[PDB]
Amino acid sequence: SKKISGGSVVEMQGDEMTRIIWELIKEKLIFPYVELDLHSYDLGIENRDATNDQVTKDAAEAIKKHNVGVKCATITPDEKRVEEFKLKQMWKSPNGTIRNILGGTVFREAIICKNIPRLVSGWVKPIIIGHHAATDFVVPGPGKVEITYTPSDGTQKVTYLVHNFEEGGGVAMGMYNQDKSIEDFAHSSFQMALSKGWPLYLSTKNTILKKYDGRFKDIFQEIYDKQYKSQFEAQKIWYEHRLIDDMVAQASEGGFIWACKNGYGSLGMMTSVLVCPDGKTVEAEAAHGTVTRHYRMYQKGQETSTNPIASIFAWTRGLAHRAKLDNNKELAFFANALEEVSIETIEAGFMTKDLAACIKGLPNVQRSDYLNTFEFMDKLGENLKIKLAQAKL
Amino acid sequence: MSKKISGGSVVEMQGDEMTRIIWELIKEKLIFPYVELDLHSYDLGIENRDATNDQVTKDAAEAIKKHNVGVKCATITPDEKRVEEFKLKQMWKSPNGTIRNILGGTVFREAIICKNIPRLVSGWVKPIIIGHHARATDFVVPGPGKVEITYTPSDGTQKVTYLVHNFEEGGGVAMGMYNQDKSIEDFAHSSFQMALSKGWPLYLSTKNTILKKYDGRFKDIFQEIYDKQYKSQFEAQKIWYEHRLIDDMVAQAMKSEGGFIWACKNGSLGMMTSVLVCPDGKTVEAEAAHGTVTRHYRMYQKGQETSTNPIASIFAWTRGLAHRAKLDNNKELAFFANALEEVSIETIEAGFMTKDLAACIKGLPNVQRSDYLNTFEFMDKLGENLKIKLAQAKL
Numbered sequence: 123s124k125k126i127s128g129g130s131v132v133e134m135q136g137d138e139m140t141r142i143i144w145e146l147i148k149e150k151l152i153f154p155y156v157e158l159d160l161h162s163y164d165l166g167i168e169n170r171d172a173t174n175d176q177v178t179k180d181a182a183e184a185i186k187k188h189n190v191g192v193k194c195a196t197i198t199p200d201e202k203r204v205e206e207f208k209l210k211q212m213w214k215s216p217n218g219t220i221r222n223i224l225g226g227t228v229f230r231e232a233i234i235c236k237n238i239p240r241l242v243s244g245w246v247k248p249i250i251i252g253h254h255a256a257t258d259f260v261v262p263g264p265g266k267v268e269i270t271y272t273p274s275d276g277t278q279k280v281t282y283l284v285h286n287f288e289e290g291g292g293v294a295m296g297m298y299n300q301d302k303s304i305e306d307f308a309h310s311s312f313q314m315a316l317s318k319g320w321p322l323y324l325s326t327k328n329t330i331l332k333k334y335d336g337r338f339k340d341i342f343q344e345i346y347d348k349q350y351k352s353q354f355e356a357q358k359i360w361y362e363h364r365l366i367d368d369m370v371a372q373a374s375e376g377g378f379i380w381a382c383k384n385g386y387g388s389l390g391m392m393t394s395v396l397v398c399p400d401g402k403t404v405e406a407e408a409a410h411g412t413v414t415r416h417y418r419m420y421q422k423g424q425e426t427s428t429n430p431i432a433s434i435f436a437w438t439r440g441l442a443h444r445a446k447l448d449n450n451k452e453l454a455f456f457a458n459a460l461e462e463v464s465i466e467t468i469e470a471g472f473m474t475k476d477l478a479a480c481i482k483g484l485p486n487v488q489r490s491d492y493l494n495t496f497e498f499m500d501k502l503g504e505n506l507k508i509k510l511a512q513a514k515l
Numbered sequence: 516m517s518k519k520i521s522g523g524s525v526v527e528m529q530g531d532e533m534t535r536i537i538w539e540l541i542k543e544k545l546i547f548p549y550v551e552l553d554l555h556s557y558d559l560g561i562e563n564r565d566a567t568n569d570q571v572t573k574d575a576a577e578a579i580k581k582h583n584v585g586v587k588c589a590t591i592t593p594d595e596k597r598v599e600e601f602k603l604k605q606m607w608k609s610p611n612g613t614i615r616n617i618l619g620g621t622v623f624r625e626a627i628i629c630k631n632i633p634r635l636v637s638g639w640v641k642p643i644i645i646g647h648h649a650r651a652t653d654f655v656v657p658g659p660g661k662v663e664i665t666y667t668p669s670d671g672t673q674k675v676t677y678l679v680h681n682f683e684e685g686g687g688v689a690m691g692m693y694n695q696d697k698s699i700e701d702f703a704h705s706s707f708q709m710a711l712s713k714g715w716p717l718y719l720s721t722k723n724t725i726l727k728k729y730d731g732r733f734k735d736i737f738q739e740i741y742d743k744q745y746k747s748q749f750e751a752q753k754i755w756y757e758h759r760l761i762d763d764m765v766a767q768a769m770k771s772e773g774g775f776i777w778a779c780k781n782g783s784l785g786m787m788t789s790v791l792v793c794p795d796g797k798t799v800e801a802e803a804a805h806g807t808v809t810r811h812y813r814m815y816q817k818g819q820e821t822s823t824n825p826i827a828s829i830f831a832w833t834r835g836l837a838h839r840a841k842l843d844n845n846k847e848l849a850f851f852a853n854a855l856e857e858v859s860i861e862t863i864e865a866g867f868m869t870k871d872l873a874a875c876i877k878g879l880p881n882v883q884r885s886d887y888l889n890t891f892e893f894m895d896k897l898g899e900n901l902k903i904k905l906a907q908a909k910l
């Protein structure tokens with residue numbers, strides 16, 4: 123009939139190559155089909171200076187309110203960026219300023235095409251990975267190193283001893299994890315499982331670290347039965363605590379949520395999702411990058427071929443979450459459909475240099491093998507058009 | 516030839532299940548017909564290990580420690596499943612570890628690369644040698660408090676505290692972990708010794724940016740050892756050592772042909788070699804990277820055909836013998852060691868291979884019987900091709 127009513131959504135504008143494909147994804151993949159009621163924020167490096175990172179904070183508050191946000195890729199400043207752009211301060215990361223105000227866990231997932239040679243040729247259903255995510259010093263010249271814990275209620279303090287250096291020279295460490303951060307890593311990663319209809323795996327190392335790692339399985343399992351237990355059976359699922367060496371072993375044709383604590387998977391097909399505990403709130407970024415090299419030669423008369431999929435899926439993840447949240451079937455379907463066409467366009471034999479580069483090595487690639495950033499973008503639209511007409515009648 | 520070659524004091528350790536069989540086959544067909552040895556063989560098979568009460572395991576370590584060379588077969592590592600299976604009276608520790616425990620040193624893995632076998636990068640022509648550097652005090656934070664590490668040199672000229680963190684919501688866990696300077700210097704040597712033993716360049720990857728003080732010590736000490744001694748031998752042998760960051764090390768490897776030692780701070784399995792290089796640079800324990808290959812052994816017991824790649828096992832020998840010959844300046848053995856390695860690859864590049872290697876070239880569903888040789892066939896091929904090479908070698 124006409125454009126689908128999506129709802130409240132937080133967009134974030136990036137910078138460099140990715141911004142170009144971002145403001146290209148919109149016009150002919152999203153915008154012609156979905157009426158978005160959107161709060162966009164410009165995280166373009168330049169804009170981030172004007173507002174003095176304030177605009178970043180705001181987008182973070184934005185998400186926390188409306189529960190759903192996408193994000194383009196954004197420069198994180200180091201020494202060059204200050205000289206190149208002339209920044210006024212060593213601006214922090216756009217992520218983090220977000221992360222440290224939202225919590226939850228990052229979930230990285232590769233996008234699998236039958237055309238693409240993967241590590242362990244047989245991984246059909248992809249694997250979702252959620253890495254949990256430091257006070258070191260030198261100990262020059264022999265002494266005694268001891269970690270101490272002194273409780274709040276003024277009861278007996280507890281000294282420990284992390285080896286004393288009898289004969290000199292060393293280096294020492296101290297790290298930790300608060301209970302509540304273990305609780306957030308649990309739900310996020312319990313919630314996630316139901317949200318894919320896939321089984322969960324916490325892989326630890328409690329045999330060695332008895333009281334550190336032990337505690338993760340001592341906070342996971344318990345929160346697995348108190349709630350979320352029946353739900354897995356209600357979805358034909360299970361959660362096992364595995365063990366690092368057995369998980370790097372049994373992984374299988376794939377299709378699970380690997381929740382581990384402690385060059386592979388190609389680049390332009392690595393989507394990320396930040397899942398907040400509540401289950402309600404979610405953020406989606408293709409966590410791959412601004413792709414500066416490509417932009418460098420885009421700003422020149424030269425032509426580029428750049429893989430848009432990751433960012434395309436960043437949208438379809440976030441939108442799928444609105445529909446899930448709001449019970450918006452019409453939207454939900456379209457999200458799935460966008461994803462479907464993306465993969466299918468690839469599997470049909472139309473792609474960019476980097477995906478062709480996986481087939482036939484870099485030296486063997488020729489021009490007749492891939493479409494460029496622009497001509498890949500049309501092909502997606504054309505086929506999306508096609509796909510959409512088909513589902514109507 | 517004429518007669519065998521005298522190789523001398525070597526220490527042999529035997530394993531379990533499928534390896535053991537091919538391990539014997541190796542000896543029968545490839546080493547013994549050609550080489551005489553003062554063998555200090557210890558039988559580390561699960562049954563025997565239980566019979567001895569794992570004394571035989573510690574007995575091997577000390578022998579390696581004395582005789583410098585040790586070629587180890589695989590071996591079962593006990594868990595509840597095995598404990599029931601063999602009716603073990605205890606769940607003994609992994610031999611490999613116990614061996615490592617008494618010896619120290621640094622393990623280096625190598626994938627044996629041949630021209631008709633696919634790689635991660637089609638660029639890699641020469642092998643890449645990766646060496647892994649390998650308790651902490653860990654405890655639970657009862658409730659809200661302030662955990663903090665604190666150091667005191669034992670000559671009261673400082674007391675330095677840091678915050679790991681103060682818990683205000685409370686609960687949680689915490690742990691501190693030292694690293695002895697000694698362990699770093701050892702790591703250095705071994706992975707400088709090995710850089711010359713194979714005559715390639717050395718790269719140490721780290722995460723300096725994040726742990727400026729921790730990783731920072733790994734960079735500095737490698738440098739001191741590289742210069743207080745090792746720099747000379749390096750430059751002489753037209754090679755270099757050069758620290759790198761982990762980020763731009765991964766990509767730098769893709770754009771290469773391999774052929775370097777990569778020190779690291781944290782293809783088929785049947786092509787994976789593992790060598791434990793001690794800091795003294797005299798002791799070495801070779802072994803395959805895989806296990807006892809239980810699934811293959813199970814079929815062998817039911818009368819089915821197996822197709823098990825021995826290469827990894829074969830290379831433990833050749834590697835070990837190469838080391839013994841290097842220590843003893845035995846040019847005859849030194850040559851023989853390269854020959855068996857020379858034959859092994861040459862045989863595979865000639866289209867004769869096990870089922871695993873076929874799978875690499877074609878893919879599981881697309882492999883037929885006519886494409887590969889079984890365990891016992893592949894062995895013959897090698898022995899026949901081996902005897903061949905050795906005849907034309909006499910010239």
Ligand SMILES: NC(=O)c1ccc[n+]([C@@H]2O[C@H](COP(=O)([O-])OP(=O)(O)OC[C@H]3O[C@@H](n4cnc5c(N)ncnc54)[C@H](OP(=O)(O)O)[C@@H]3O)[C@@H](O)[C@H]2O)c1
Nearest residue numbers: 195196197198389390409410411412413414415428429476
């Ligand atoms: N905010 C974020 O989510 C995020 C994430 C990562 C990096 N960054 C920022 O990126 C800036 C510097 O870029 P970088 O050096 O890290 O490069 P990058 O964007 O991480 O990409 C590095 C290489 O990955 C390949 N690649 C990535 N995406 C691709 C795609 N869609 N299509 C084709 N190839 C793709 C390209 O390799 P080829 O050279 O072979 O073409 C590119 O040169 C830094 O300021 C960093 O902070 C931001």
Ligand SMILES: NC(=O)c1ccc[n+]([C@@H]2O[C@H](COP(=O)([O-])OP(=O)(O)OC[C@H]3O[C@@H](n4cnc5c(N)ncnc54)[C@H](OP(=O)(O)O)[C@@H]3O)[C@@H](O)[C@H]2O)c1
Nearest residue numbers: 589590591592611784785805806807808809810823824871
């Ligand atoms: N001492 C050691 O160095 C060591 C190391 C690791 C494991 N182990 C012992 O191994 C026992 C269990 O075996 P596992 O499950 O670990 O099997 P494994 O020997 O580690 O190998 C697992 C699978 O890899 C393939 N494979 C391994 N080596 C091969 C070769 N040489 N040629 C062709 N294919 C090969 C086979 O897969 P396909 O069946 O699909 O062909 C095999 O089933 C454990 O009890 C463990 O203690 C010992």
